[PDB]
Amino acid sequence: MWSHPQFQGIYISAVGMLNALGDNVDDIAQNLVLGQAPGMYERSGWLQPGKTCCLGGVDAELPAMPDMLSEHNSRNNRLLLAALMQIKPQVDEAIARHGRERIAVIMGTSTSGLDEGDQHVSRTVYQQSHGSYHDYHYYQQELGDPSRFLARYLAIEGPAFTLSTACSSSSRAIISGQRLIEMGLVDAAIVGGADTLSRMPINGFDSLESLSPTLCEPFCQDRQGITIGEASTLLLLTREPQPIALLGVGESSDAWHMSAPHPEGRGAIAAINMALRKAGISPAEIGYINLHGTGTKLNDQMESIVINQIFGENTPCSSTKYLTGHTLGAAGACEAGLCWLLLTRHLPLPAQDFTRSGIDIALPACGLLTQSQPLEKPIVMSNSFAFGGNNTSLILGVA
Amino acid sequence: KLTLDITDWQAIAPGLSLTEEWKAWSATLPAAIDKSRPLEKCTQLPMMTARRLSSGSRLAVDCGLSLLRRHQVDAIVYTSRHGELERNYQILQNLAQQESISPTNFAMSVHNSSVGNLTIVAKAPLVSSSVSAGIDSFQQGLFEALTLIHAGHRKVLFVDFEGEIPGFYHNVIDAKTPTYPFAVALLLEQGAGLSCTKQSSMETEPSLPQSLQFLHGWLRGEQHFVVSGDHCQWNWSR
Structure with a gap:
């Protein structure tokens, strides 16, 4: 009835x-x-x-x-x-x-x-x-x-x-x-x-x-x-x-090496794609990416290739590890916290530090910030790529 | 409270590796391990590979590989209270003695080196997690496995393990603390074959690891069994 x-x-x-x-x-x-x-x-x-x-x-x-x-x-x-x-x-x-x-x-x-x-x-x-x-x-x-x-x-x-x-x-x-x-x-x-x-x-x-x-x-x-x-x-x-x-939220494993990343960034791509589909958004809806960007030869090369592939050249991104350092186990939550502060306090986006040796000319264009600028979309992403090929992507947004 | 199905298992502890050894042991009370009994050799790893993993890690990767050869799994969770304590101790001794650190020893000292090495050896790019929660690493780690089932991973390989505790630490651990290597691998699925509810307890530092308390009660086949933790207990029912 x-x-x-x-x-x-x-x-x-x-x-x-x-x-x-x-x-x-x-x-x-x-x-x-x-x-x-x-x-x-x-x-x-x-x-x-x-x-x-x-x-x-x-x-x-x-x-x-x-x-x-x-x-x-x-x-x-x-x-x-x-x-x-x-x-x-x-x-x-x-x-x-x-x-x-x-x-x-x-x-x-x-x-x-x-x-x-x-x-x-x-x-x-x-x-x-x-x-x-x-x-x-x-x-x-x-x-x-x-x-x-x-x-x-x-x-x-x-x-x-x-x-x-x-x-x-x-x-x-x-x-x-x-x-x-x-x-x-x-x-x-x-x-x-x-x-x-x-x-x-x-x-x-x-x-x-x-x-x-x-x-x-x-x-x-x-x-x-x-x-x-x-x-x-x-x-x-x-x-x-x-x-x-x-x-x-997005997660993946490279199944490649214990300390070096998948050279094609297969795991990074899988984690980012999973987070975008959970949020029900396209790459174009991201206003800023807080990169993993550790400063190793292999990490930064792989990551520039992955961001170029998914986002192209026009999504603002930077690694803040020249300010905090690589906080290892703490990095994922530290950088999610910085992203929460950018959103709640309407802060300008942090530039990549090119004041010392300058950008690696071999890396593809992937929207690395050469200067601070305002956040134009109220959605931010933070990525982490770890030993044992363990990858996460987090997306925060104004409700 | 949690409910799940367990559809397969593989385990190794001192004197216990063959199905018949585990079944005979589940028929014996009290549930106990003799640390003087030998461990079986790894069956899925070349001896050179096995001997380069730590005492617990080699068992955990071997038991995991055994289940990956029998099943298509969607995600992997490893749990360990003490993690790579033998490697950590070796590196702290390198620092005390002003000796060079082995880069491989350092890279393999991360808690997730066991699950990471399994994904590499099995060519299995599956979602992986690695959990530590003191005495309750096994029981709390089941919550991590349930989050992955909730997120759409149908079959989750779950492996609890410890390596040998170096003699150096025997004066700073409880007299009851197990010090031998072992691993327990379970294949977890969505279902209601088993339920578990947590309660307060007056017990702590169990003499038998949680995953072995679990395996004893589960293989023994009684309707209700208990796993003891850190001033808590976990009430299992079939």
Whole structure:
């Protein structure tokens, strides 16, 4: 018989950030427009043997780890706690409204407390007493510690886990939180991640001949590899409408090499296409692309070819890694956060830095910004291409 | 709460690799591993390849390859609590001793090196994820697998693994913490053959890894079984 017929999109409600551009979203927004990162400078004691290294650091005094949570006392978790303090009222409202069981905590990291693990090995091997005041716990170095710490701190009883897919970790975290809300398992998700400076990735990238000792120059003639940075980003995803929508997400694997990209960018193309089709838009509707653009020979070549193929020559794009550094596991959420700031604060688009060696003349035209300009369409894309050929594309838009 | 179908499996742990060994073990209480029992050789990898992967990674890639040879899969999720801890420890020792780091050792130290190496060896450009969540890496990682099924991936290869924990760490882990290598591979599909609900628990640092608690209860065939985690438990029903 007849019955009465009257008887979902994910949004970003809040973002907390720390990186080389600043200790809060106000300072980061200002410094992004100015093109200056106060935390980006040469630091001693990281790169062996006895070398200085340009690094993107967070120099801010970080909140103390409450002493009842000392098992989680890493700089990595104190950076996450600093980001959480920026969005604490919004997080408290979500928990109170939806309940502890209907919030997820999905983090990404490639380090966790790796620096604390490094200190523990060196201090133990050489019985060092004076240099170190740190109360080490194995939990600090576990890759699952970011989500474990935040869930314990906030009493979140919903899904809680950390993605560790190298440079795509914290962008995969955004995808997984978005899906857990779409699925109806939770109403909101705290997503993002943090990576902290450690001798292990700095000397590891040096061993790959992929570390620039001097500030990276993505897409430039003289580029000699990456500049490492650290960052924390937390985004509060929700089914409740907010000014900024997460319009599209895309993911792929190259199945090519553990550290070099697919030479034809097959995986990058698949991730970008998937994000555009989820958002229901054409390449022409993108106002800006925040590129991966690490400053390696192979990454920047592949990426210029992929953007030329999908977008042509007229879509504004740049890599901001000459400001933040390559924040590794934190890069996906850091750059999504910068894209959220461009949209919410109506900021001019950041130029590619061509002030040093100039553009690589062998790369195809792909719309690299030679100067700052206004955003002409209220939709932005951020891409991440990681070790193990792991690719993400995120699309943010004004709702 | 989650519901899924599990349509195939492949696993290796000390003294356990053959179907008959796993089935006999599922009939025995309590569920236990003798770390002094030998591990079987990799069957899908050339020995040179297997011996260049770490103790847990080689098992995880081998079990994954076994299932990829039997099935068309759409996506892959690997889970591990400790990840590439042996490689991490080697590199932290290189830094302490002011020795050169092996670039291959560094590249393979990323948590997703197991799933990445599987996609390369199998020529399988499939969506891949790699999850860590402490004691609950297996149970929380099932949520990552369910997001991929939700997103339209019909058949998801799911592999939980650990490598050997270096003796260096034995004084900073719980006395109960398992320290041996193992891998459990499952083929997950959309369905309601199994349901799982999470509850509070007074237990932590289980003596048996979650994926092996799961395999024991699942193979044993009782209507209800429990997987213990970090002050939580996971109530499975058939």
